[PDB]
């Protein structure tokens, strides 16, 4: 029986491994809840120059 | 080299240096919450021995998740001459 022991260390250190952050589609010109890299908000996204 | 708990490879920080074509490379190093932050900016300099007069902002460059205490630092140099045979002069680089 091939066996692997994974030991995770969550201590006082800058975290290096994390679960992937999945996303959804991006919709503009509409009032929407947005979350960009942890920045949360509610508003209308429009093309900015 | 033990507990090698971090390795990073990327494009050169210091570009090619290949007569008075001096270059100013300014860097800022910080150690905050285990994150090692390096900021830098580069500009060709013209016949100014010391720091010049002007304003140039350093753009963020790299944030390393190294997370280990730091107290001291030292710069790394290049031996163009030979250690066993130190010549009288001109073996180095323009004194």
From Swiss-Prot, chain B:
Effect of residue 87 to V: In strain: Omicron/XBB.1.5, Omicron/EG.5.1
Effect of residue 48 to E: In strain: Omicron/XBB.1.5, Omicron/EG.5.1
Impact when changing residue 69 to Q: Increased resistance to neutralizing antibodies
Glycosites: 3, 69
Chain positions covered by the region annotation Disordered: 11-20, 81-95
Result when mutating residue 50 to G: In strain: Beta/B.1.351
Phenotype for residue 25 to K: Partial loss of biliverdin affinity
Subunit structure: Binds to host ACE2. RBD also interacts with the N-linked glycan on 'Asn-90' of ACE2. Cleavage of S generates a polybasic C-terminal sequence on S1 that binds to host Neuropilin-1 (NRP1) and Neuropilin-2 (NRP2) receptors. Interacts with host integrin alpha-5/beta-1 (ITGA5:ITGB1) and with ACE2 in complex with integrin alpha-5/beta-1 (ITGA5:ITGB1). May interact via cytoplasmic c-terminus with M protein. May interact (via N-terminus) with host bilirubin and biliverdin, thereby preventing antibody binding to the SARS-CoV-2 spike NTD via an allosteric mechanism.
Protein's job: Attaches the virion to the cell membrane by interacting with host receptor, initiating the infection. The major receptor is host ACE2. When S2/S2' has been cleaved, binding to the receptor triggers direct fusion at the cell membrane. When S2/S2' has not been cleaved, binding to the receptor results in internalization of the virus by endocytosis using host TFRC and GRM2 and leading to fusion of the virion membrane with the host endosomal membrane. Alternatively, may use NRP1/NRP2 and integrin as entry receptors.
Name by which UniProt lists this protein: Spike protein S1
Species name: Severe acute respiratory syndrome coronavirus 2 (2019-nCoV)
Location of this fragment in the whole protein: 163 to 260 of 1273
């Amino acid at each position: 029986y091939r066996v692997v022991v994974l030991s995770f260390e969550l201590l006082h250190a800058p975290a290096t491994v994390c679960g992937p952050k999945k996303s959804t589609n991006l919709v503009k010109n509409k009032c929407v809840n947005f979350n960009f890299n942890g920045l949360t908000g509610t508003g209308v996204l429009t093309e900015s120059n | 080299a033990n507990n090698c708990t971090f390795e990073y490879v990327s494009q050169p920080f210091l570009m090619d240096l290949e007569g008075n074509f001096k270059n100013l490379r300014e860097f800022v190093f910080k150690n905050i919450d285990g994150y090692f932050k390096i900021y830098s900016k580069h500009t060709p300099i013209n016949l100014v021995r010391d720091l010049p007069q002007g304003f140039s902002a350093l753009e963020p460059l790299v944030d390393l998740p190294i997370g280990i205490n730091i107290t001291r630092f030292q710069t790394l140099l290049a031996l163009h001459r030979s250690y066993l045979t130190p010549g009288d002069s001109s073996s180095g680089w323009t004194a």
